[PDB]
Amino acid sequence: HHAADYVLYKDATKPVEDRVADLLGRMTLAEKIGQMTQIERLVATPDVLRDNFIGSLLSGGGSVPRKGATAKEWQDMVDGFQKACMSTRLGIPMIYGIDAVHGQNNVYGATIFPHNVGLGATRDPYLVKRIGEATALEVRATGIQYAFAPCIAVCRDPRWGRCYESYSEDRRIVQSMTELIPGLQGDVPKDFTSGMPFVAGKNKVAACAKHFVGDGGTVDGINENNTIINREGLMNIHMPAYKNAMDKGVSTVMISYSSWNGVKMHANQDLVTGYLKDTLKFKGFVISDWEGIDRITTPAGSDYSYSVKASILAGLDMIMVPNKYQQFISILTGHVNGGVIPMSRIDDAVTRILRVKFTMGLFENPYADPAMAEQLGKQEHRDLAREAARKSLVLLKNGKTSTDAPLLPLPKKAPKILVAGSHADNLGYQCGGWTIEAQGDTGRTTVGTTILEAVKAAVDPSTVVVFAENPDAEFVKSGGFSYAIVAVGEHPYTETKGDNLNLTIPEPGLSTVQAVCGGVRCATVLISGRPVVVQPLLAASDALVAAWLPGSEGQGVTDALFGDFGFTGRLPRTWFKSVDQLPMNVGDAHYDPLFRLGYGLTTNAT
Ligand SMILES: CO[C@@H]1O[C@H](CO)[C@@H](O)[C@H](O)[C@H]1S[C@@H]1O[C@H](CO)[C@@H](O)[C@H](O)[C@H]1O
Numbered sequence: 001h002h003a004a005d006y007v008l009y010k011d012a013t014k015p016v017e018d019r020v021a022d023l024l025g026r027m028t029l030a031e032k033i034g035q036m037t038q039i040e041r042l043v044a045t046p047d048v049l050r051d052n053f054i055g056s057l058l059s060g061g062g063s064v065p066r067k068g069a070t071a072k073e074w075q076d077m078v079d080g081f082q083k084a085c086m087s088t089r090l091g092i093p094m095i096y097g098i099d100a101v102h103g104q105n106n107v108y109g110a111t112i113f114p115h116n117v118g119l120g121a122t123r124d125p126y127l128v129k130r131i132g133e134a135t136a137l138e139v140r141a142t143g144i145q146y147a148f149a150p151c152i153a154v155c156r157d158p159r160w161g162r163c164y165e166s167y168s169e170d171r172r173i174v175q176s177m178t179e180l181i182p183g184l185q186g187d188v189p190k191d192f193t194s195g196m197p198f199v200a201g202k203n204k205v206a207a208c209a210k211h212f213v214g215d216g217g218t219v220d221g222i223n224e225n226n227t228i229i230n231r232e233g234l235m236n237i238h239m240p241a242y243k244n245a246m247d248k249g250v251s252t253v254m255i256s257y258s259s260w261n262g263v264k265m266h267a268n269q270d271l272v273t274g275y276l277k278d279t280l281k282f283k284g285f286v287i288s289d290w291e292g293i294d295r296i297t298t299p300a301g302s303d304y305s306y307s308v309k310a311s312i313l314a315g316l317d318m319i320m321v322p323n324k325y326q327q328f329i330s331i332l333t334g335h336v337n338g339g340v341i342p343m344s345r346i347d348d349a350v351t352r353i354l355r356v357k358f359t360m361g362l363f364e365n366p367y368a369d370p371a372m373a374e375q376l377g378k379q380e381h382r383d384l385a386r387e388a389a390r391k392s393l394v395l396l397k398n399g400k401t402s403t404d405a406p407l408l409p410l411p412k413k414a415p416k417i418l419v420a421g422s423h424a425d426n427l428g429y430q431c432g433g434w435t436i437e438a439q440g441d442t443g444r445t446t447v448g449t450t451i452l453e454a455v456k457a458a459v460d461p462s463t464v465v466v467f468a469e470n471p472d473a474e475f476v477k478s479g480g481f482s483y484a485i486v487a488v489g490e491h492p493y494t495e496t497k498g499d500n501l502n503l504t505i506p507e508p509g510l511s512t513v514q515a516v517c518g519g520v521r522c523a524t525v526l527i528s529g530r531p532v533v534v535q536p537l538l539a540a541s542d543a544l545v546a547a548w549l550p551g552s553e554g555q556g557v558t559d560a561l562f563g564d565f566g567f568t569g570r571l572p573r574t575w576f577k578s579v580d581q582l583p584m585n586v587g588d589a590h591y592d593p594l595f596r597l598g599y600g601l602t603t604n605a606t
Helices: 014-025 030-037 046-051 073-084 116-122 124-139 170-183 231-238 240-247 269-277 304-314 325-337 343-359 370-375 379-392 425-430 451-458 471-477 511-515 535-540 557-562
Strands: 037-040 055-059 093-100 209-214 250-255 284-285 394-398 416-420 464-469 482-487 522-527 541-546
Touching: 014 343, 030 037, 030 325, 030 343, 046 073, 055 464, 073 093, 073 370, 093 231, 116 124, 116 170, 116 379, 124 170, 124 370, 124 379, 170 231, 170 240, 209 269, 231 240, 231 451, 269 284, 269 304, 284 343, 304 325, 304 343, 379 541, 379 557, 416 451, 416 511, 451 464, 451 482, 451 557, 471 511, 482 511, 511 522, 511 535, 522 535, 522 557, 541 557
Parallel strands: 037 055, 055 093, 209 250, 250 284, 416 464, 416 482, 482 522, 522 541
Antiparallel strands: 394 541
């Protein structure tokens, strides 16, 4: 169509499939393998990106241009990488990915939304869609086009260090929360074919349904371990939400470190090619997890030639290397040159990668939009996170006896009140993992409102608010307090570091609740990624709230505590009596919960 130097793949008016085929047909082997290679920004330079025709970059947890970097600093970094990629012979733009799993959470000043388990407690898929929409904007504020979300694991054992990244042990709730996808990506057209990738344009991001499949079913909640279950169970529990993701046009799927009945997912041709691609008709691209192909072998990385062969033959399209790109490209190149991996497999991988890039508009808008920078931490997004935090809270107790006056909602006007506990004034603890760093961190790590700051912002001006992190019983008894709010719970974690067989919160936690509640009526706010041993905390407390990991907007907690809104959250997980019961999920033959899935007391707004 027209000009003398006309190149069909560069024509924005052409059908995506025609552009894919036109570009694919021009590519060298090095250009093709390049597209299949994703590298860490930490090993990227302009020459590396050009010389190896690199297809993608990512930031791993905490991989940031610097501490406290502005949105514009992120845009300038991503654009610098993109300029190198656009300078190659074919000018194929890279796609930049990041774990934006509860907001754009690596980024200083990004809105931090509640983690997925709390979102499950809301039973509000439209809320989650809106969170997807806000997250896409904050990711694009930083120049990034791809989010490694949603985690649609169905966590079947809360001893797993990623249980907080699962919306529920009930696959029906997880399925419902796949609305994150059209939030992040845009709603698909009316005519849409299930399994096709979709992103609306430059103000949306590619999403990633992860981790395929059965990541939430591992033995004893051991991260990256074995999921031992028959096909009927895999398909009944762990698979369904992937079909919902296909119906909603999820652009990518990431493979799990875990195994299914002893077969590494990263090597499972039957499930990746036979099921995901050939049965669900997935037409986006399949990405590895971080050194996921390395971990096919024991020890990991001990036969990388086999790792490349097994993963690429299984049907993976893009490999999150993420560091040793030279070894990966060299080995894959050798496998193709030796006929071990057919060109048909390379061409399929590249077809899918290009399909996503063309579909999302990346060839038309390869660079960041500086006008989007102000989306980062934008107050409307924080108001949304605040709504979400509030809706996530599950009221487990509100009065020690049925004769007692309900403690909650608390009055905003009282002469003097106490705020206490390790988690009352700690923004990092209330955000949990995947906040600034992978494992999270302690203290004021980003912009937000702690529980203490939220209480001070909510109460009548005549109300004196005292903070004591770990007061003794005498301090409380002598203080003249009307009531106390005491916040305790889990420290931030992710992945294997969070695997935990005991599920008891660290001390001082219980001792502080006991000291405070022994002296004055108390509302205990439990900050956790999962159910934890709770009977001792309940016994001490007048009221107790499961607040999960509510994120940067602590005023979501006080909105409910002080009756601006009624409590509405319902447990999205079984609360066990003892870890000896685990695994124990709703619908099990022997089901003896402390609180069943769906439990939640309510209050009315005052
Ligand atoms: C950021 O990657 C994590 O960090 C540690 C240390 O660098 C690695 O050893 C972990 O295996 C990965 S876990 C993996 O990270 C992906 C990219 O960040 C993420 O999308 C996925 O959900 C994780 O399983």
